[PDB]
């Protein structure tokens, strides 16, 4: 122990630390260069005549009149529609298992975006066209946790890993407004707005979320048993009977397709200051929020 204890007892015999004996760490304060004196004056590093010394050289990209590189290349739609492309932050099974082992995500309760964000497992940016998380297969071989997880996209192998261990995986759509709310609920509650309804997927995404192969949240529940059995056969494992599990009720807990949060209905106003919930009773309002 030559560090902590030697650095403090050696301070006992030194002058008091004061505002008169402070200095920056060496290397943190590079010297400033001024155009004064033989070395740095005279032409001051600007050269001689031309546009150079006078400060009027052409814009960046200009090549002296030759048709510039960045113009003579043909246009091509590499980035066409980039700002309207849906993005999904990848969440690997390695990362998910890591979060569970450290107690950052609780597998005893349903896992959705809110719990993933609250555990600092994933960072979602709705303003950057993130539409949620995509569960990726990386780490499937060593994934052991039993979870009920709700994601936006899931690979076939990732789904098989979840369901071989006795867990349940569902793919759930969130519109940009809903995604912002579900990711950061507290900032939303401070706006004093009724909880909005979750919008349906766009027409181009309806096939994905109505298909049992993807465990879509709008798919026919009667088709899941066959889909679950097919993966068990393909990847050589026996489909567990989760109906016999002690956590079966929790494993079945799923949000209504119009519900952003478990246990909270559209049109409810959360009063955090008084720790209350306000529910509208007007028939017209109730019809709007329930439709």
């Amino acid at each position: 122990q030559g560090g902590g204890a030697r650095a403090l007892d050696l301070l006992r015999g030194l002058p008091r630390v004061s505002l008169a004996n402070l200095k920056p760490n060496p290397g943190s304060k590079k010297p400033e260069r001024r155009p004064r004196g033989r070395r740095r004056g005279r032409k001051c590093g600007r050269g001689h005549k031309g546009e150079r010394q006078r400060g009027t050289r052409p814009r960046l990209g200009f090549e002296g009149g030759q048709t510039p590189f960045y113009i003579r290349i043909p246009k091509y739609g590499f980035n066409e529609g980039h700002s309207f492309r849906r993005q999904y932050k990848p969440l690997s099974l390695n990362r998910l298992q890591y979060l569970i082992d450290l107690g950052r995500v609780d597998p005893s309760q349903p896992i959705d975006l809110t719990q993933l964000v609250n555990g600092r497992g994933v960072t979602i940016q709705p303003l950057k066209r993130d539409y949620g998380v995509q569960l990726v297969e990386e780490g499937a071989d060593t994934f052991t946790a039993k979870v009920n997880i709700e994601v936006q996209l899931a690979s076939e192998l990732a789904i098989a890993a979840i369901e071989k261990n006795g867990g349940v995986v569902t793919t759930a759509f969130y519109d940009p407004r809903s995604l912002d709310i579900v990711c950061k609920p507290v900032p939303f509650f401070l706006r004093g707005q009724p909880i909005p309804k979750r919008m349906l997927p766009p027409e181009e995404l309806v096939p994905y979320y109505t298909d049992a192969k993807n465990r879509g949240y709008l798919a026919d529940p009667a088709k899941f048993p066959e889909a679950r059995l097919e993966l068990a056969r393909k990847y050589g494992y026996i489909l567990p009977d989760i109906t016999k599990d002690e956590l079966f009720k929790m494993l079945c807990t799923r949000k209504d397709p119009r519900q952003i949060f478990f246990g909270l209905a559209p049109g409810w106003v959360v009063n955090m200051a008084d720790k209350k919930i306000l529910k509208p009773t007007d028939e017209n309002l109730l019809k709007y929020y329930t439709s």
Partner: protein, 252 residues
């Protein structure tokens, strides 16, 4: 008569042991050694980082600086529209305006252009670490004294001045109480009439004040306050939104 024995509330790392300081009182001239208080080693025995003290001290001096210095360019000086004399033929140097920076009474070429702000913010964790370093340095150099309370027998400033002299507390003493509202009236009266003995609440503690004052006095409640706030920075998540907004386990 019973000793005031304070223990560290928050978990101390297993490889480290608490440091200790005498608990004293201001009720009498010889009322030293009233107790013995343990102090968390990560707050009062961190590595002595003088470079970090410089960073935080320099931040404190400059982050709220606004310079009001301003000069006029050649465009803002009164007049100066016309060309003072023809370009050619007069034998004189060529000039375009009587308010050129070459001219007496002309504009300033590269003068101050205020108001100018110097605002910047060190990372929150760095500013918290600086406070830890300052407390450790004071303890390591025997400039830190822990009090049970700041209650004086009288409000006379001479008593407090004489007390510091007898106890060899240097020329200047920073007195830190837990809260502004609950400061004892006696210490408030004494310090209000002094210049080198300054009374501040715990929320007002800062590196610059600690370095300007030779001696630092903390009450036992203040010690608990400081350990809680500074150690919270070591074990906290990266924020999801400003800590002023509701969290599950914050505040307290």
């Amino acid at each position: 008569p019973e000793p005031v024995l304070r223990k560290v509330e928050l978990p101390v790392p297993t490889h480290r042991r608490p440091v200790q300081a005498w608990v004293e009182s201001l009720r009498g001239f010889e009322q030293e050694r009233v107790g013995l208080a343990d102090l968390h080693p990560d707050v009062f025995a961190t590595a002595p980082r003088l470079d970090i003290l410089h960073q935080v001290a320099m931040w404190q001096k400059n982050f709220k600086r606004i310079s009001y210095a301003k000069t006029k360019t050649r465009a803002e000086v009164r007049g100066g529209g016309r060309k003072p004399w023809p370009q050619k033929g007069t034998g004189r140097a060529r000039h375009g305006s009587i308010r050129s920076p070459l001219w007496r009474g002309g504009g300033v070429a590269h003068g101050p252009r205020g108001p100018t702000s110097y605002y910047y913010m060190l990372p929150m964790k760095v500013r918290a670490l600086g406070l830890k370093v300052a407390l450790t340095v004071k303890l390591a150099q025997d400039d830190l004294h822990i009090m049970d309370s700041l209650e004086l027998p009288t409000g006379d400033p001479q008593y407090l001045t004489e007390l510091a002299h007898y106890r060899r507390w240097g020329d200047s003493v920073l007195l830190v109480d837990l809260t502004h509202e609950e400061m004892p009236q006696s210490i408030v009266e004494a310090t209000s009439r002094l210049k080198t003995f300054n009374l501040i609440p715990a929320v007002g503690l800062n590196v610059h004040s600690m370095l300007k004052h030779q001696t630092l006095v903390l009450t036992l409640p203040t010690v608990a306050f400081l350990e809680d706030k500074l150690l919270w920075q070591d074990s906290r998540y990266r924020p999801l939104y400003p800590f002023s907004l509701p969290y599950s386990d914050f505040p307290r």
